[PDB]
Amino acid sequence: KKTQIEKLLEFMYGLNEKEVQLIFRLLYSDTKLNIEELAEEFKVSKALISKSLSELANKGLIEREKVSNEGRKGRPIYVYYVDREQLFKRISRDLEELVQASIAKLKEYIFKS
Amino acid sequence: KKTQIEKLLEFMYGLNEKEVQLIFRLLYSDTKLNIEELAEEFKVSKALISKSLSELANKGLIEREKVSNEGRKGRPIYVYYVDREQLFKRISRDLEELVQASIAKLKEYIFK
């Protein structure tokens, strides 16, 4: 089954369950992870897992950090991890902004429509 | 497509698309409404709309009012409506509680 928290992250941020799972996979990782480690674990293409990580990183839910300027292919190399305080701060802030934007919109529906 | 608010009510109260429309049909009415006109409007049987109205009233999302005990076979007759202040206060409070409960839960998961 899925927790209440999983269902909430999915709604707030428009993420599929796996993307949500990915956050918790990284939160309970001892080491930082690159694209190719994640693509092999999750059994998917680098393009797919890159899209998800990118969406998680833009939203500030995971950390994306450069560990090399040139990698075997001459491109920068990034690792992905979860910062526990940052993660908790981001969600809390997002949740307060969602509640306020909702109540405001509700007010307009229920009283001014 | 679906309104974000409609999306929120579906998520919060486990309601389908038609239940939210039912709530808004009541909200936007100038009068209380009986099951016969609502069954007709929502194109379902009286039993079905009656079951839905009863479950929405037990969620507190709408109000019910018994107006007669003299339906066929002594079955009660009800009217349904939405108390606009109470609905605002309910959803507002439920939203605030959902967020605090969520933040507490993942505070213990991220840290404890």
Query: DSSP code of A62?
Result: S
Q: CA-based diameter of chain B, in Å? A: 60
Q: How far apart are the two ends of chain B, measured CA to CA in Å?
A: 41
Resolution (A): 2.5
Q: Helix and strand tally (H, E) in chain B?
A: 5, 2
B66: tokens are 């018994």
Residue B88 backbone phi and psi in degrees, to 5: -55, -50
User: How many Å apart are CA B76 and CA A83, to the nearest integer?
Assistant: 58
Alpha helix ranges (H) inside B1-112? 4-13, 17-28, 35-42, 46-58, 84-111
Contact B33, B26 (CB under 8 A): yes
With tokens 């993307």, the residue in question is A19
Task: Give A62's contacts in chain B (Cβ within 8 Å).
Answer: none
A103: nearest CA partner in chain B: B92
CB B68 within 8 A of CB B77: yes
Q: What is the DSSP letter of B43?
A: T
Distance from CA of B72 to the nearest CA of A (A): 36
CA dihedral (B47, B49, B52, B56) in degrees, to 10, reads: -130
Report whether B4 contacts A105 (CB < 8 A).
yes
Identity of the residue numbered B89? K
Read off the tokens for A89: 């701060």
Nearest to B106 among A5, A99, A111 (CB): A5
Experimental technique for the deposited model:
X-ray
Residue type for B27, please?
Answer: L
What is d(CA B80, CA B33) in angstroms, rounded to the nearest whole number? 5
- Written as six digits, the tokens of B35 are 């099951």
Say how far apart CA A103 and CA B48 lie, in whole Å.
Answer: 31
Contact A84, B110 (CB under 8 A): yes
Q: What's the CA gap between A36 and A54, in Å, rounded?
A: 14
Chain B: nearest CA to A84, how far in angstroms?
6
Residues 67-106 of B with CB under 8 A from A: 84, 87-88, 91-92, 95-96, 98-99, 101-103, 105-106
- Show the tokens assigned to B108: 């213990």
Tokens of B20: 């939210």
Cα separation, B8 vs B46, in Å, equals 28
The vertex-A66 CA angle with A63 and A70, nearest 5°, equals: 155
- State the first-to-last Cα distance of chain A, in angstroms, to the nearest integer: 39
Three-class SS of residue B16? coil
Q: Is any Cβ of chain A less than 8 angstroms from the Cβ of B12?
A: no
Closest residue on chain B to A112 (Cα): B28
Q: Provide φ and ψ at A88, rounded to 5°.
A: -65, -40
Q: Give the DSSP letter of residue A67.
A: E
The stretches of chain A forming alpha helices (DSSP H) are 4-13, 17-27, 35-41, 46-58, 84-111
- Given the DSSP bridges, would you call strands B77-81 and B63-68 parallel, antiparallel or unpaired? antiparallel
